[PDB]
Amino acid sequence: MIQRTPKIQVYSRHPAENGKSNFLNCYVSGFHPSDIEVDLLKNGERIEKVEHSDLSFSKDWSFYLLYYTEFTPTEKEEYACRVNHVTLSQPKIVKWDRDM
């Protein structure tokens, strides 16, 4: 058996074909086993509609998840990604740095 803690990066992107739109991304990488729970949060509350969830693997024991959706942030709002995984004794919350 092998288990590996996910790395978690939270960042924003504008698709080049539609630069006015903005997407909040949580990239959860290199984890095993594949069982996992991932949410985007706004002011600590789960965002129910997340329109993209793309899972892949490299080696049979390394998984990658890009979890992202359109958003329109204001400076007073806090966004984050919350991950639960067997390697994590408590949920890991990674805040979105608004300059990223």
Numbering used by the authors: 0 to 99
Task: Please quote the paper that reports this structure.
A recent case of systemic amyloidosis involves the highly unstable D76N mutation of beta-2 microglobulin (β2m). The D76N mutant is strongly amyloidogenic and, in contrast to the wt protein, aggregates efficiently and abundantly without seeding and under native conditions. Indeed, the 76 position is located in a solvent exposed loop between β-strands E and F. A detailed analysis of the interaction energies of the ensembles reveals that D76 is at the center of a network of stabilizing electrostatic interactions that are lost in the D76N mutant.
